[PDB]
Structures are given as structure tokens and as C-alpha cells.
């Protein structure tokens, strides 16, 4: 098969396939969901037991068996043929929803040429005297992201018809990926290389514009302080582990294909670490930028809870203007109780109990933490147009890189069967894949689209990857491993594997993965039903509602039709081999 | 004051109440010239003020030039001030959010400036470049079969 | 006017002379309060034109 070049690429392709939107978009949203410093510790713990050794295992297997993501396993024990099919199905389900993020980034970048920015002012109401109702309870940006780009219906039951704009943007994103995948992975080096270098000259610009905002240290002192209370929440730990397995790509059967091409003179033990660390490190970097800007937003909100109330007080019982800042606030709030109890009894239920600890925690909850925050720092700049263009170009580039990786992982085991690459040229295989995925991705752009995106973001990927990384290791180390495997030798010559890698991927990966699995199911089963977060415009705050029935069915099927292929293939061999 | 001007804010002594009364009389003079085509010589003593306070929130009403029992109805004072509010404001440097009249609110200016739908424009152009690419590439492709 | 405002320039009827006289009286009121510490009630009829 074709090969690599310069060598310095292979590691740039791995770095560009791992630094994707699992770090600058999904890690902040997760870290915000579970408390900040209650999501880091698990992260590191994992990364030093279950993220690095399995990456080294995957690269070694992909280098020694010399074949793709399905041919690699058949050559071990033909009763283990399914794992490749599960690893292809998962990558299919992943790309199908992963491209809509690039779609939304295109939509925002397109709208960021107007003036003034459309998410910076709210429309005028039915009598040209004040802003609209949703834009006063909710900020401007939340109104934009929930009612101009999505038109999100307030219930997973009240569905609708295909929207018009974000569908067209999804079409453009698929055309761009299909246009870039016109060269075969075996040689897409240029594009790979370019991504990374790009997406690093921006994050530092936002780190210099973040850490000087007024009220940008409260966000940090929140993102780092730990709470030994949520170190019980099992969803936090299973989400840490799945976060990892999703960020590196362990289980998508892609990394394998990569450490598959590459010439067999590498030193793999030093291309695992140099990848793994960098990945994790970049995530930390992003979580220092966002959870600073976010912090600023929070302080802003709190500042107003002090203006209005104070002004409110200033308006009622009267008081010389400019006399109720912050300290004076409490002062007069106290001196107005013991002086005018006639109206203090009827105003007291109103005084908005608003204090910094809340507005720092429930401000921009949801899947849009990278969209309704980085705007709260773009509508406060010098020349906002150019810098919003910069940030959204960064997101778009990361997404395109990650999608390149995924589509390569799904085309490698399709352009190898001498049957299929016999009556379909190498230009219409990619075409067929992109057309099918764009025609199926039109379910996330309806009026109830964001909920289906939340489902496909929460079950599929994570669960599948988990359930798989276990069969892989138990296949390499107790069916044909350690022995013949440690007999790597002539492959590289690193004389051995260090006895801190034998233990870690023959007797610690399976124990920990099985333990975490049961530890998570012990909560899903007794919880009852599952609950999602709806919009409820009439107030501008997300509420919680329990899932309907068929949504539960689809959650079940997205894990069944992805982790139930291995035993079906085992049965297919046990029963095929009859006569 | 201290909200709008922030600093540089002057102090509100009776010489300011004099200017306010005189300016309101001017506004009333203007209204009865370009609506009712009369000539009524309002003065600064025809603007009665009541309940001055720290917040500086008072009440006022206007009477005919020399007829103490003749109060100009409120729905006409609410129109003269609507006419000349932009000129009463700058006399004090206030800005329509620090000179509330509690019953007269501003309302003039809607948003509709885009003639061309810039989003559409940009999207359109971009799709062009990429289609060109994903066409020409296909041809160099059949070129090397 | 037409030089400074260019357009939007209002017209100069006697209601403007009234405002001018009243504002000058206000200025004089202010001067005899922060220089000479007196209280002199100037009016708009004390500014002859
Ligand atoms: C804001 O806080 C005040 C005081 O903490 C709350 O006032 C109390 O309201 C409860 C009703 O839920 C009464 O039983 C108490 O007697 C009230 N306390 C006092 C001192 O009057 C107020 O309800 C809070 N606001 C909101 C919206 O919950
Ligand atoms: C002062 O204004 C009052 C109006 O408030 C005038 O009173 C009117 O007088 C006429 C005839 O004298 C009556 O027909 C009206 O009914 C009166 N008005 C009201 C409301 O009752 C009064 O004449 C004015 N003073 C002068 C000197 O003209
Ligand atoms: C507000 O606008 C409507 C037209 O939509 C108009 O008919 C109505 O009189 C206006 N009301 C006020 C109080 O200005
Ligand atoms: O790298 C991948 O395959 C995707 C995108 C980043 C994390 N998971
Ligand atoms: Cl990560």
C-alpha cells in the first residue's frame, strides 16, 4: 500500500486527528456540566492508566499486522472478525453527527460580516419602544443561538419540518469535506499539517484577550477549585473515561490504520506519549481560555443584579442618586427595613436574591458553551468583526481536520475489498459516502434538532468505544499476546516492552473498564427514566423533562447495533464452518 | 445626574430650577405656535413646581399666562414636551434616560438597513470556489484515471 | 446657524430670543452666587436687546 513521507508527518496526522473538537468544544461543555475541578482529577487519573497504554497497544497492533482496521483482527482469530465491523459502524454514526458542528460554525462565520453583529443587539418589539421579551430575560446571544439559528421547539414531542438555512450550511460542510478527501488518506499530508499550526496561534491570542478582562479570575478560581463532594457522581467518572476514549480515538479503528501505513522502522513508544500528552495538554489550555471569558460573563451578570436592585431601591423609598453602590447597598438595605416597614413588607418578596456563586454556575449551561460564550467576549472587543472571524475560523479548521480523520477511517476498509473496488472507481466511493451521510444528517436540522444532537452526542460514541476497548485488549493479551507480541523485536528493536506496559494493558485496562461499566449501569437502571433540558421560551431558562418512549428505544438501538456485532460475527463463524 | 454625567456633574441649586422652568415655558410657547397658530406668552412663573426632593423628582404643571384658575390639560403638556424633548435634554446635558418624564416614553427608530442579505451573498460566493475545486479535481482525476 | 448646523437648522423666531434672554439671566444668577455670594433674582425682562 502507499506509504508516508518525511515521517514527521505521521505524528502530525495523529496530532491533527486528536486535537479536534473533542478539546476546544466538548471538553469545556463537559467540565462545566459537572463542576469544573470535579472533572479534572478523574481526567488525569485516567490519562495515566487507561489513555496512554491502550494508545500504545493500538499503534503497535496497527504496525505489526500491517493491515487496516478489519484485516488486522481477522489475522488474529477469525472468530474475532466482528470487531472491525463494530469499529466501522461507530465511526459512521460519529461522522453523521460530527459534521453538523462544522455546519453551525459556517453559519456563524457567514453572519459575522454584518454590522453591528447580529447577536449584539436585540430586535425591537411590536411598538418600537423596547427590546423583545426573550432578549431581556435571556441575553442577546442566547436568543440568537436558540431562536434565529435553531428555532428550537420546546419539546421533543412537538417536532416539525426541515429547516431551511442550517440544512444548506450542512450541505456546504459536506461539500467541503468531500472536496478535501479527494486525494486519498494515503497522501492527504498537506491539509493535515496545516490544521494544527493554525489552531495554536489563535488560542494564545484569546488567552491574552481573556486574562485581562475585568472579572476573569473568578472564572479561573472556579475552574480549578476542587469539591470532594462530586467525587461520588458516577456519571462524572464514566464521562471522564469516555471523554478520553473519544478524544484520542481509541476504538474508532483509525489510529490503527495510521500506525498501519507508516514504515516499520518506527519507535512507537515515543509516538504514543508525544501524542497523548499533547492532546491532554491542549485540552487544559482551552479550559483556561473559556473558563476565563465565561467567568467575565458571570461577573457582568452579577454586576447588573446589583445595579437594578439598587436603582430599584433608589426609585422606591427615594434616595440621593449615586448612593447605593455595593457596600452602601447592604447598608441602606438594612436601614430601610427599620425605617419604612409600611412598604418593606411588600417589597421584600421582590428583592432579587442574586449572588455570585449561582450566576457563575448556571449561566450558559448546555451544548452551546462554545457558541454562547465566545460571543460574550467578541461583542466586547476593538474591531469585533475580524476577531470573530478568527475564532470561528479556528473552530472550522479543527472540525474539518477531525472529519477528515473520520472519513478516512471509514473509507480505508471500504477501498480494500477487491469486490467493491472492482465496479466503482476511487472517486465515487467517497462520493457515495458523503452523499449518504449528508442525506441522513438532515434529521439534526429540524425544529427539534438540538435534542437529537444531544442524544447522538451522549450515547453512541462513548458507550460503543468503551464496550470495545475491552474486547481489543482481551484479544491481544489472552488469545494471542504478550508472548508472540512481546516478540516485537525485529519490528523496531526496542529490545522489549517495559514492564510498566505489560501490566497496564494486560491486567489493569480490563479490570478498570469493567469496573467503571458496572459502576455506571448501577445508576442508569435505578434512575428510572432519563431527562433532557428543554428551552421553554416563555421564561428563557432550560427546564428538565423526562424522555418519551421511542427516544428511549433509539438510545437502546444506538448501543445495540454497535456493540452487538462482535457476538453475531462469532456466531457467524461458529455456524458457517459447518459443512 | 451622577449616573449620566458620572463626573463633572454640576449641583442642583435653584438657579437650575429656574432654567428648567424657563425651558419648559419655551417648549409650551413653541407648541402653541406650530399646532394652534396662537401667540401665548408663557413665563417662568406659570410653571408651578411641587414636592422637590433628594432624588430631585418633582411634579409640575402649567397655567395660562395670567389666569391662576386655568390649568392647561395634561394631554397637551405631554405633546409640547414630546415635540421639544431633544432640545430640553441638551440644555442640561442629560440623555433621555436620566431625564425621565414618567408618562412619556421615547419611540422612534426601527431596524431594517440590509438591502442585499450579506449572509446569502457571502455563502453564495464561497460555495462557488469549492464547487470549482470539486469539479476541476474530478477532471484531473479522470486525467490520471 | 446654517454654518454650524448646516442642515436641521431651526429658525430664529421670538421664542428663541426668549430662551436666549432667559439663559443669559441664568448665567448672571450663577455668577453672583459663586463669586460675590449674593442672591440676586435676575429675570428675563432684565436683559435688554
Ligand atoms: C429572597 O430571600 C428572602 C429572605 O432570605 C426570602 O424571604 C423569605 O420568604 C419566605 C417564603 O419562601 C418566608 O417564609 C420568609 O419569612 C421570608 N424571609 C423574610 C426575612 O422575610 C425570599 O422569599 C427570597 N426570594 C425568593 C424569590 O425566594
Ligand atoms: C380663566 O380660565 C377659566 C377657565 O378655566 C375661565 O373660566 C371660564 O369662563 C367662561 C366665561 O367667563 C365660562 O363660560 C367657562 O365655563 C369658564 N371655564 C370653566 C372651566 O368653568 C376664566 O374666564 C379665565 N379668566 C379670564 C380672566 O378670562
Ligand atoms: C402602538 O402601535 C400600534 C400599531 O402597531 C398603534 O396602532 C398603537 O396606537 C400604538 N400604541 C401606542 C400606545 O403608541
Ligand atoms: O479525534 C477524533 O477522532 C474525534 C475528534 C476529536 C476527538 N474525537
Ligand atoms: Cl480530551
Residue numbers in the entry:
A (entry chain B): 5 to 583
B (entry chain A): 624 to 768
C (entry chain C): 624 to 672
Reproduce the article's own wording on this structure.
Additionally, we solved the structure of the ACE2-SIT1 complex bound to Pro at a resolution of 3.3 Å. Our structural analysis revealed that SIT1 adopts an occluded conformation, consisting of 12 transmembrane (TM) segments arranged in a LeuT-fold. TM1 and TM6 are interrupted in the center, forming two small helices that are connected by an uncoiled sequence, constituting the substrate-binding site. The substrate is sandwiched by two critical gating residues: Tyr21 and Phe250 (intracellular gating residue and extracellular gating residue, corresponding to Phe48 and Phe277 in B0AT1, respectively). An interesting characteristic of SIT1 is the extension of the C-terminal end of TM7 into the extracellular space, where it interacts with the Collectrin-like domain (CLD) of ACE2, similar to the ACE2-B0AT1 complex. In contrast, the Pro-binding pocket is smaller than that of Met and Gln, with its α-carboxylate group binding to the carbonyl oxygen atoms of Tyr21, and the side chains of Ser251, Ser406, and Asn410, while its α-amino group binds to the carbonyl oxygen atoms of Phe250. Additionally, in our structural analysis, we have identified a putative ion located on the extracellular side of SIT1, coordinated by the side chains of Asn27, Tyr47, Gln247, Ser251, Asn283, and Ser287. However, considering that the coordinating residues (Tyr47, Gln247, Ser251, and Ser287) are conserved in other well-known members of the SLC6 family, such as SERT, which has been shown to bind chloride ions, we have placed a chloride ion at this position. RBD and the occluded conformation of ACE2-SIT1+Pro provide important clues for substrate release. In the occluded conformation, Trp8 of ILpre_TM1, Phe14 of TM1a, Phe262 and Tyr265 in TM6b enclose a π-π interaction network.
B0AT1 (SLC6A19) and SIT1 (SLC6A20) are special members of the SLC6 family that rely on the ancillary protein Angiotensin-converting enzyme 2 (ACE2) or Collectrin for their membrane trafficking. ACE2 functions as a peptidase that regulates the maturation of angiotensin (Ang) and serves as the critical host receptor for SARS-CoV-2, while Collectrin is a homolog of ACE2 with a similar tissue distribution, including the liver and kidneys. B0AT1 is responsible for the uptake of neutral amino acids such as glutamine (Gln), leucine (Leu), and methionine (Met). On the other hand, SIT1 primarily facilitates the transport of imino acids such as proline (Pro) and pipecolate.
